[PDB]
């Protein structure tokens, strides 16, 4: 089942490595969604009307363009992108994986996250260039990750962020 976070700006559905959010701007809606693989979203608005995210909210079901976006059918001027595997270091733990974008101000960007001890683990790899990657092991959001990625930051190294885990298992 999807987790619903719903505003005035928008809407969002989340499962653990799955998100598809709906964004009201001046021009009308805009969307991003991605899975473990696949990552689609527009810069320009698309036809998804305010009653069909109702619908979702309250059925579980889909708008069609979802629909035809997980189906491999995609619209006009949709970004389509494959995400690198998830990240070696967390894979036994089952982590969650989300994508941030340039709707937030990002160059796109997956993180791979785990909550472990009361800490997060997170891997965060630009999508265009995989080697790009900020290890992150501390007491804030997995969103930090990507953040300093973002800014250039330095981040664990591999010898670190592995030694984090073994300690969180």
Request: with cysteine; net charge positive; aromatic share 10%.
């Amino acid at each position: 089942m999807y987790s619903v976070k719903k505003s005035k700006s928008g809407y969002i559905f989340d499962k653990p490595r799955e998100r598809i959010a709906f964004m009201f701007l001046k021009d009308g809606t805009y969307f991003m969604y991605h899975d473990g693989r696949i990552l689609c979203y527009s810069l320009k608005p698309v036809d998804v009307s305010r009653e069909e995210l109702e619908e979702f909210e309250r059925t579980g079901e889909p708008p069609e363009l979802i629909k035809r976006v997980k189906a491999g059918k995609y619209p006009e001027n949709c970004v389509v992108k494959e995400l690198p595997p998830i990240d070696k270091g967390l894979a036994q733990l089952n982590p969650n994986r989300k994508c941030v974008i340039i709707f937030t101000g990002f160059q796109d960007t997956v993180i791979d996250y785990v909550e472990c001890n009361g800490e997060t683990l997170a891997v965060a790899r630009l999508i265009d260039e995989p080697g790009k990657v900020c290890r992150f092991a501390g007491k804030g959001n997995y969103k930090v990750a990507a953040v300093k990625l973002k800014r250039n930051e330095p981040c664990l190294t591999r010898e670190e962020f592995l030694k984090k885990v073994e300690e969180c298992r």
